Structures are given as C-alpha cells and as structure tokens.
Amino acid sequence: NNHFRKHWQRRVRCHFDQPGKKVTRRLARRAKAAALAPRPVDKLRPIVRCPTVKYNRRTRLGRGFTLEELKAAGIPRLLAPTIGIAVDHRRKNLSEESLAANVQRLKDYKARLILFPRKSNKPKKADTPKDQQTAETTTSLRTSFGVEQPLAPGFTEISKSEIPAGIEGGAYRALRKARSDARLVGVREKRAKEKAEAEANKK
Amino acid sequence: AVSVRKRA
Amino acid sequence: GALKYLEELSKKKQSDVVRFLLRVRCWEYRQLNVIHRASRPSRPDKARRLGYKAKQGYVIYRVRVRRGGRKRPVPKGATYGKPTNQGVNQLKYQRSLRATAEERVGRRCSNLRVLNSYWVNQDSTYKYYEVILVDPNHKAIRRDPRINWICNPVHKHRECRGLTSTGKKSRGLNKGHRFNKTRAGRRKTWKRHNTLSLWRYR
Amino acid sequence: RRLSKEDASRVLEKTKKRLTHFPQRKYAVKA
Amino acid sequence: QEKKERLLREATAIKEGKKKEDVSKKPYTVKYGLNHVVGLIENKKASLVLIANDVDPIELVVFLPALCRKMGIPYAIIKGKARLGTLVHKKTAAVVAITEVRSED
Amino acid sequence: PVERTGLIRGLNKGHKTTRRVLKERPSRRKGAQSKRTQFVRSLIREVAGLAPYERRVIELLRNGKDKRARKFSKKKLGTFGRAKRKCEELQRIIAESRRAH
RNA sequence: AAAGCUCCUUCGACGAGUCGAGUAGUUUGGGAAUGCUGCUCAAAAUGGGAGGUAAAUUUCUUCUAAAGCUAAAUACCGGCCA
RNA sequence: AGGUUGACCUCGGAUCAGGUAGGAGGACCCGCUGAACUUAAGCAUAUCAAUAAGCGGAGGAAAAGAAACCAACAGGGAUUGCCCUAGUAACGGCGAGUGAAGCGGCAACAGCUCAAAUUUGAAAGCUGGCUUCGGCCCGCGUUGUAAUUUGGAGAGGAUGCUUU
C-alpha cells in the first residue's frame, strides 16, 4: 500500500528548518510581547464544550465570548475587544450553565483588570487609580485563565446510606426498552390514531 | 400612506 | 426609492414591456460595435447594487460575446490520438462568457480596473454584458476609502485571475462539503494532498 | 504609482467615530 | 450664491446668540430627484407631479403614472427633461413635484 | 423546550441541561414580508402583467385541469414545491379576478 | 456637536436570465450523495440553501447565496545579503 | 428675428491640460488549455494526470477569508498551515489501482464595507484651473455625490448617567 506511482520526488518536503522556524517563532513571540507590554500577549477566551458524542465529555477554549455573556457581565461589545477580550457573534447560549460559567469568567477578568487612563493628567472614573495601578501582572491569559477542569472528576466518595436505589428493572432493560420505544414510536402513534378513528366512527 | 421607515 | 421598482420590474423578464425593451435594445446593441462605451448604465439599480457610483472615475463598457460551446483549434477539427468518444462541438469552456467579456473589456481599457459586470440582454448569437470599471489614477477614486483598495497593485487584472464574482463562481470558492476540492484553491489543495512530508525524527 | 500617505490613512466617518470613542486601551491583568 | 449669504446671515445670528430659525424662514422650493419624488408620492406629500416624456432608460419612470394613480396624486407627463432641469438648476431632471406652495399661490 | 431523559439512546436522549429561551436573531427574519415590499410587488405585478406560461396555467385552472396545470408548472419551473406554490398564487389571482367581476 | 449603555407599543427595506430543474461535456472519493461550463425552461416571500439513496406528506436543526475589503501563522531550484 | 434664438441627449475632432497600460522576471502564487511514454497479458473505461509542454495575470508573498459552514452534540464557530483523522468512508473493465471530510491538539489570530430609506428646513459631496493661500471660478452630479444603516442588527421613541 505505497502511493509512489506519481512523480512524488517533485514535491518531497523535508523539514530541516524545524529548529530555525522554532527560533523565528520565538523571536516573533518575544517581539509581540515587547510591543504589547504591559498587556498580556493574547486575548481572553471562554470555556466551551466540544461537540459530538465522542468529545462532549471535555471542555476547551473557544473563539470568543457571546453578546449575551458580555451583556450579563456588563462589558459593552465595543469596549470588549479593546481590553483583551475576544468576542464571537456566531456562538449562542443554549443552556444556563455555560452562560453562567462564562459570565463568572468575565467577572473575574474584570475584577483582575487594571485599566490605565487615556491621558495621564486626566484620569476618568472608569480607570484604575494611580496608587492601585502598581501590582504584579500576568502576560499569559492562556495560563492564568486556562481550563482548570477539562474533565469531570471520575472518582468520588459517598456513604452507603446515600447509595442510589437504581432504576427499576435494571439498566440493561432500561436501555433495551428505550431503544425499542425509539424504534416503535411511529407505529404505536398510527395505531392510536386508527383506534381513535374507530371510536369516532362507532362510539 | 406607505412609509419606508419611521421618520423623526 | 425607484430602484426597488426597477428591481421588481427587471425580475419579470417575460412581461410585454420588458420583452419590448429587450428586443429594441438587442437591435441597438447588435448594430453597435462589439465593445463600446456606454454613457450611462442601462440598468442603474443593478449597477448600483454591484458597486457603480455616479462619480468621476467610474465608467461603463458594453460588450457582446459569441455564445455556445468551445471548439479545440486542431486542423480539420479532428484529434489523432486515442479516441475520445465525442466531437469538438460538445467541448465546454470552464469559464463564463461573462468572464471572457470582462477580459476583453479590460484589454480594451487596460488603464482601468474591472470592478464587476452584469448581463443586459442576449440573443441566439451573442450575449451582452455591461462592465463597471474604476480609474485607479483618479484623485476622486484615490481619496475615497470605500474604493481606494482597487488602487493597490495586488488588484491588477482581477478578471484575468478570477477575482471577480464570475471568477469566484468558476473557481468554486464556497464553504462546505460540496466544494472540498476547490474552496481554498484546487491546484494548491492537490499539491498539499500529494506532497510527501518527511520530518527529522520520523 | 503607490498611494500617498494621507490617501492611505484616510478613514470613513463611522470608523473615525469608533476610533475616537473606543481606541485600543493600555491595560494590565493582576496575577 | 444665495445659500452663501444665507449661511453668512445665520453665522452672524448664531454669533450674536440667536437660532437659525429666528433669522431664516421656511423654504418653499420645487422638489426634484427621482428617489425623493417617489418617496413623497408614497408618503402622499406631493400635491402635483410632472414627469419628463423622454427619460432614457424608460424603466425609471414607467411605473410613476401607476404609482400616482394608486396613491391618488395628480400627475402629468410633460416634454423636456432639460426643460425641468432649467427649473431645478441642472442639465436634466427626470421628474419634479410640488408638495406645498405659499399662501399667495 | 422538552427536557432530555438523560440516557444515551431512545427518545429525548442526551445530557440533562436547563435549556434557555432566546430572542430571535434578526438574520432569521428573512422571508418575512414587508409592507413596502408588498406594495411595490403588487404595483409591479399590475404594471407588468403575466408570463406566457403563467397565462397557460391560468387557462388550465379556469378549465379545471388541476393535475395538468400542476404537471405543466412542474415542467416549466423544475420542482414540485415551486409548481404547487405557483399554482396556489395563480388560483389566488383567479379568485381575486372573479371576486372583482 | 457627535458617541456608548438600558428598556420598548411599533416598524424592520436584505443582491434575478440569479437560484433551481432538464440535458450534454468534463471533473471528483462523491460511475446512488461532487464541482464547473454550454443550451432550453425559469422562481419565491418565514421565502431560499443545506442536512452525502430517488419520491409524496408532516415536522425539526442550521445558516442567509447570486455585491466587496482585510494582516499573521504557509510556500519559494528567481534576485540580493549572510 | 420665429425659416429665428436656444436648452438637452448621443456621437466625433485636437501634437488640447493632466495621467495611465504594454516589456522583463516568472523559484513560489491565481486561472485557462492540455498530452503521451508508463501501469493495466495486449487494450478504446481507467493509470500516468485534473501532470509535462503552451497561454493570460500579481506580489513579497500570492491565494483564501469573516458561513446561504460544520454538525445532530451538554452543540462548535472567518481563512490558512502542521500532526491526526486515514490508506479510513468511498470510487474502480477482465482490477491494476485511486482516495477525501467533520471532530481533536497545536501555530497564528482581527475585524469589517456597500445596494436596497427623503438631508428635503436648504448636494451638506468631489475632480480641475487661478491664487494675494483668505478664497474665487469652470464644472461632475438629483437617472443621486456626503452624513446614517448592514442582519452581530438597526429605524423610531422613553430614560438618566457616562465618552471625546
């Protein structure tokens, strides 16, 4: 099973420039950090759940926060990209839990944010006071605001007094019954409509 | 009357 | 606005008024030259929605192109290799007559930049298009931030590279599963799939 | 044939308002 | 020119602390421009509509008699888009309209 | 919204979450008819008239050959749904004309 | 003078020989589900597209085409410097 | 004077005033067009290959790009690139063979502009010429140049604080 029937030698890509590219990327990262000092080098990202039944067990970082999250955190959508927060207009909040988690994330970021004034002579009420501007800072939001619990805890202790009773009939019986009900949802409804029609015809 | 939008 | 009424009127191309106007305009454009300047667009709503403005530096050029298929220029129209099971009468050009018209109009006015183009009329022999062109050297164009992107040298001859609307349509630059081979560039994707990657610590 | 500096730096009125009232701020995050 | 003296007079008024409405009166002019006249007809503000007979392309004004008949606007087709342009200080005017005139007229 | 059963299979399968009600996105307003759009389309319709295939479907519906009109509309347009909608609006046109007359 | 936030009775325009259909050529893993082009027909207003087996009926989920701009990570047997 | 005097529209002329294009290079990039040797026992499907040759067009990158997307989940969320998916799904005479994509981890991240609205209590917009550098003219333009709006919304209201 070797696919060497075309002119493969014309487009062989060797990777001897891997350490040179790593050095170039590190130089670009340090230049970006020096240009963006004292701000962090990257934007804040929300915690989103991976799609599909294979990966829904694990959460990760998303593209940006939703407008509902920004509104509930009290951050205007025009101020948000100017203070290092990423905004994603396509994403929606279909449940309360992710909305509350991202709102709490934005609230912690807002509480830990230090906002320098536009002019040093005239500080506004929304800006950080000069005596409070001096504090230890972080430059990696991916590390400081990372995914602390990507997976649920797979090990938990309960007492035997509070053990669950269990579903009646058994879990395997419950799964078989659910599958059979899903496969027979339509036929039972049609027979119910037929019985209702017979009752209406000959009540 | 047909109005395109509300007018100030 | 009247352009909404012009839009809904131009949707009904088989009504009596639109058929009469299309017939008389077909006769006039067939009597005129193959490529000629239009003083004003014949479809102002279509030109305006495609990006035309009534500003110095915007011009309209009308063009007719012979319609039908493409014939391979071999002597006596016969191929002398392996049999192809088909004739040259059923070969199809992979780009549009609109794109061919855009290239011919650009070669007629090489100092301008082709913005977009639109169908105006057709008959059995020709299809008729009107092409909007922008002057990259006009001060009114260069001072407008909505259009001075076309003054950059990267936008030279968009119609020759397929950067116009019909060019993107022919290149299949659409998102989705139906455009897997062509959404990022067909030959680039083919090279990416057929290249062999050999890392150092393999 | 390159565009002049002022023509390249021209912005629209809406963009001018957005840059006037919401520019890129200087900020820091506590650790 | 008349706009220049009007703006100069309004500038003097706002310099000595009066509103522009205190020194300037409500204007009464012939309404023109195709989109403007179509909007006035749709809002039933135009009292009279004059449409040029030689508009090329004809689709710009081919619906205007029917629009005026639906909205109950008195309309008339007249000869000369250049003749209307002489009214509106232009070379060409496809359609003009009167919404209101003065009490003397 | 209906509550999920919390099982991996069956009806209403999936992990239990508190579903939200959300304000309708303005991108989903497309297809809703506007007052100005209705007025403009009605005026353009009475100015321009009908297409020849539309007149053919009109006379077929006047004769009462509904299946033949549906087949001709499908042949002219391409899809059964577009044919059905075209036949419905032409029947509405016939009804409006007969209620006018 | 412009600008943002909060709430709302109401309004809320959104790209046509275009989408789509048939047919022919070509292409594709998409010779049952691909894209492009030519010819013929040719749309609509909660409409339209998609949901990889053809069709009718009833639903559901996603977006919003036929106008346009935009750095970076990517490529480099040409040129220059090392 | 009315057989006159003009206003527009369209089409021309000028060694008119001011500009622009051609050719080179083409390693990489965007398209068009397009083989055969080879591999299939031979050989018109196929493979080579949507390659070589030929043609048009750019730049330091080009192209693509902010969903008429993926999905079917507790939902992800512009484009590009690497690893993986995976030699898998799938396609294929008489079989030699061909062959993706979603998710996932990473690199890098950046968002937006028009048409469809009447400024109508005032084309507020712009090219060119002359300048005493204050401006003044010839004009373009209402068959629509400015401000505002782009679906993430917005328009109209109500409300009380903030911003330049």
PDB file of N, CA, C and O in Angstrom, chain C residues 1-3 5-6 9-10 17 21 25 40-44, chain E residues 34-36 38-39 42 56-63 67:
ATOM      1  N   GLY C   1     -37.712  54.933  -2.916  1.00  0.00           N
ATOM      2  CA  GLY C   1     -36.738  54.836  -3.986  1.00  0.00           C
ATOM      3  C   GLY C   1     -37.267  54.101  -5.200  1.00  0.00           C
ATOM      4  O   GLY C   1     -38.031  53.146  -5.075  1.00  0.00           O
ATOM      5  N   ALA C   2     -36.857  54.554  -6.382  1.00  0.00           N
ATOM      6  CA  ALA C   2     -37.288  53.940  -7.629  1.00  0.00           C
ATOM      7  C   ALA C   2     -36.532  52.663  -7.966  1.00  0.00           C
ATOM      8  O   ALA C   2     -37.023  51.865  -8.772  1.00  0.00           O
ATOM      9  N   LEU C   3     -35.361  52.447  -7.364  1.00  0.00           N
ATOM     10  CA  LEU C   3     -34.546  51.297  -7.731  1.00  0.00           C
ATOM     11  C   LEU C   3     -35.165  49.990  -7.252  1.00  0.00           C
ATOM     12  O   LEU C   3     -34.929  48.939  -7.855  1.00  0.00           O
ATOM     13  N   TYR C   5     -38.430  49.484  -7.452  1.00  0.00           N
ATOM     14  CA  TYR C   5     -39.361  49.235  -8.546  1.00  0.00           C
ATOM     15  C   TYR C   5     -38.637  48.713  -9.779  1.00  0.00           C
ATOM     16  O   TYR C   5     -39.140  47.817 -10.465  1.00  0.00           O
ATOM     17  N   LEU C   6     -37.449  49.255 -10.067  1.00  0.00           N
ATOM     18  CA  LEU C   6     -36.649  48.729 -11.176  1.00  0.00           C
ATOM     19  C   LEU C   6     -36.213  47.289 -10.927  1.00  0.00           C
ATOM     20  O   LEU C   6     -36.146  46.490 -11.867  1.00  0.00           O
ATOM     21  N   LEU C   9     -39.225  45.109 -11.484  1.00  0.00           N
ATOM     22  CA  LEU C   9     -39.558  45.115 -12.902  1.00  0.00           C
ATOM     23  C   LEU C   9     -38.575  44.268 -13.701  1.00  0.00           C
ATOM     24  O   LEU C   9     -38.969  43.563 -14.636  1.00  0.00           O
ATOM     25  N   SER C  10     -37.290  44.314 -13.339  1.00  0.00           N
ATOM     26  CA  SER C  10     -36.286  43.526 -14.041  1.00  0.00           C
ATOM     27  C   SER C  10     -36.364  42.050 -13.687  1.00  0.00           C
ATOM     28  O   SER C  10     -35.815  41.221 -14.419  1.00  0.00           O
ATOM     29  N   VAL C  17     -43.622  44.663 -21.547  1.00  0.00           N
ATOM     30  CA  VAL C  17     -42.801  45.872 -21.542  1.00  0.00           C
ATOM     31  C   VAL C  17     -41.312  45.522 -21.524  1.00  0.00           C
ATOM     32  O   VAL C  17     -40.514  46.090 -22.285  1.00  0.00           O
ATOM     33  N   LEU C  21     -38.566  46.186 -24.551  1.00  0.00           N
ATOM     34  CA  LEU C  21     -37.339  46.932 -24.287  1.00  0.00           C
ATOM     35  C   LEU C  21     -36.104  46.093 -24.593  1.00  0.00           C
ATOM     36  O   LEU C  21     -35.129  46.592 -25.170  1.00  0.00           O
ATOM     37  N   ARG C  25     -33.395  47.057 -27.485  1.00  0.00           N
ATOM     38  CA  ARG C  25     -32.018  47.216 -27.037  1.00  0.00           C
ATOM     39  C   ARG C  25     -31.104  46.169 -27.660  1.00  0.00           C
ATOM     40  O   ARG C  25     -29.935  46.455 -27.930  1.00  0.00           O
ATOM     41  N   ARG C  40     -24.151  55.856 -19.880  1.00  0.00           N
ATOM     42  CA  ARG C  40     -24.710  55.582 -18.567  1.00  0.00           C
ATOM     43  C   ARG C  40     -25.167  54.133 -18.551  1.00  0.00           C
ATOM     44  O   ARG C  40     -25.435  53.555 -19.611  1.00  0.00           O
ATOM     45  N   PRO C  41     -25.221  53.502 -17.377  1.00  0.00           N
ATOM     46  CA  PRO C  41     -25.703  52.115 -17.314  1.00  0.00           C
ATOM     47  C   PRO C  41     -27.169  52.013 -17.709  1.00  0.00           C
ATOM     48  O   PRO C  41     -27.993  52.847 -17.330  1.00  0.00           O
ATOM     49  N   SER C  42     -27.488  50.975 -18.484  1.00  0.00           N
ATOM     50  CA  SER C  42     -28.869  50.725 -18.872  1.00  0.00           C
ATOM     51  C   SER C  42     -29.681  50.105 -17.746  1.00  0.00           C
ATOM     52  O   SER C  42     -30.915  50.124 -17.804  1.00  0.00           O
ATOM     53  N   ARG C  43     -29.016  49.553 -16.730  1.00  0.00           N
ATOM     54  CA  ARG C  43     -29.661  49.000 -15.542  1.00  0.00           C
ATOM     55  C   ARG C  43     -29.030  49.680 -14.332  1.00  0.00           C
ATOM     56  O   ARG C  43     -28.100  49.135 -13.713  1.00  0.00           O
ATOM     57  N   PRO C  44     -29.488  50.892 -13.994  1.00  0.00           N
ATOM     58  CA  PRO C  44     -28.860  51.635 -12.888  1.00  0.00           C
ATOM     59  C   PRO C  44     -28.976  50.951 -11.539  1.00  0.00           C
ATOM     60  O   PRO C  44     -28.042  51.040 -10.736  1.00  0.00           O
TER      61      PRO C  44
ATOM     62  N   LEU E  34     -35.361  61.686  -8.387  1.00  0.00           N
ATOM     63  CA  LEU E  34     -36.317  60.605  -8.615  1.00  0.00           C
ATOM     64  C   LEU E  34     -36.680  59.885  -7.321  1.00  0.00           C
ATOM     65  O   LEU E  34     -37.860  59.633  -7.052  1.00  0.00           O
ATOM     66  N   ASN E  35     -35.678  59.557  -6.501  1.00  0.00           N
ATOM     67  CA  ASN E  35     -35.940  58.857  -5.245  1.00  0.00           C
ATOM     68  C   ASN E  35     -36.723  59.737  -4.280  1.00  0.00           C
ATOM     69  O   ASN E  35     -37.635  59.266  -3.588  1.00  0.00           O
ATOM     70  N   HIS E  36     -36.388  61.029  -4.239  1.00  0.00           N
ATOM     71  CA  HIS E  36     -37.091  61.978  -3.381  1.00  0.00           C
ATOM     72  C   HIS E  36     -38.555  62.110  -3.783  1.00  0.00           C
ATOM     73  O   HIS E  36     -39.452  62.078  -2.929  1.00  0.00           O
ATOM     74  N   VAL E  38     -40.345  59.930  -5.548  1.00  0.00           N
ATOM     75  CA  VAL E  38     -41.021  58.654  -5.307  1.00  0.00           C
ATOM     76  C   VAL E  38     -41.383  58.509  -3.832  1.00  0.00           C
ATOM     77  O   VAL E  38     -42.493  58.077  -3.491  1.00  0.00           O
ATOM     78  N   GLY E  39     -40.471  58.904  -2.938  1.00  0.00           N
ATOM     79  CA  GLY E  39     -40.784  58.883  -1.517  1.00  0.00           C
ATOM     80  C   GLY E  39     -41.909  59.829  -1.141  1.00  0.00           C
ATOM     81  O   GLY E  39     -42.762  59.493  -0.315  1.00  0.00           O
ATOM     82  N   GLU E  42     -45.154  58.256  -2.281  1.00  0.00           N
ATOM     83  CA  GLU E  42     -45.526  57.160  -1.389  1.00  0.00           C
ATOM     84  C   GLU E  42     -46.024  57.667  -0.040  1.00  0.00           C
ATOM     85  O   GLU E  42     -46.901  57.044   0.567  1.00  0.00           O
ATOM     86  N   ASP E  56     -34.403  58.194 -20.558  1.00  0.00           N
ATOM     87  CA  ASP E  56     -33.700  57.018 -21.062  1.00  0.00           C
ATOM     88  C   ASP E  56     -32.735  56.570 -19.973  1.00  0.00           C
ATOM     89  O   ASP E  56     -31.808  57.330 -19.622  1.00  0.00           O
ATOM     90  N   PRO E  57     -32.893  55.364 -19.398  1.00  0.00           N
ATOM     91  CA  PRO E  57     -33.866  54.292 -19.662  1.00  0.00           C
ATOM     92  C   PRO E  57     -35.286  54.597 -19.184  1.00  0.00           C
ATOM     93  O   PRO E  57     -35.471  55.330 -18.215  1.00  0.00           O
ATOM     94  N   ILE E  58     -36.277  54.020 -19.869  1.00  0.00           N
ATOM     95  CA  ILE E  58     -37.670  54.366 -19.606  1.00  0.00           C
ATOM     96  C   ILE E  58     -38.183  53.665 -18.351  1.00  0.00           C
ATOM     97  O   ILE E  58     -39.224  54.049 -17.803  1.00  0.00           O
ATOM     98  N   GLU E  59     -37.463  52.651 -17.856  1.00  0.00           N
ATOM     99  CA  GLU E  59     -37.910  51.923 -16.671  1.00  0.00           C
ATOM    100  C   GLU E  59     -37.868  52.771 -15.408  1.00  0.00           C
ATOM    101  O   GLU E  59     -38.495  52.402 -14.408  1.00  0.00           O
ATOM    102  N   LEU E  60     -37.144  53.892 -15.427  1.00  0.00           N
ATOM    103  CA  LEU E  60     -37.058  54.747 -14.250  1.00  0.00           C
ATOM    104  C   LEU E  60     -38.381  55.444 -13.956  1.00  0.00           C
ATOM    105  O   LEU E  60     -38.660  55.780 -12.799  1.00  0.00           O
ATOM    106  N   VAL E  61     -39.205  55.673 -14.978  1.00  0.00           N
ATOM    107  CA  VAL E  61     -40.449  56.416 -14.828  1.00  0.00           C
ATOM    108  C   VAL E  61     -41.658  55.666 -15.366  1.00  0.00           C
ATOM    109  O   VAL E  61     -42.751  56.238 -15.407  1.00  0.00           O
ATOM    110  N   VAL E  62     -41.503  54.404 -15.775  1.00  0.00           N
ATOM    111  CA  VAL E  62     -42.611  53.694 -16.409  1.00  0.00           C
ATOM    112  C   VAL E  62     -43.671  53.302 -15.383  1.00  0.00           C
ATOM    113  O   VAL E  62     -44.838  53.089 -15.733  1.00  0.00           O
ATOM    114  N   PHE E  63     -43.298  53.232 -14.107  1.00  0.00           N
ATOM    115  CA  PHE E  63     -44.225  52.896 -13.035  1.00  0.00           C
ATOM    116  C   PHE E  63     -44.821  54.120 -12.355  1.00  0.00           C
ATOM    117  O   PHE E  63     -45.744  53.968 -11.548  1.00  0.00           O
ATOM    118  N   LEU E  67     -48.150  54.457  -9.999  1.00  0.00           N
ATOM    119  CA  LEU E  67     -47.961  54.803  -8.593  1.00  0.00           C
ATOM    120  C   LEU E  67     -48.795  56.020  -8.212  1.00  0.00           C
ATOM    121  O   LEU E  67     -49.429  56.045  -7.149  1.00  0.00           O
TER     122      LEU E  67
END
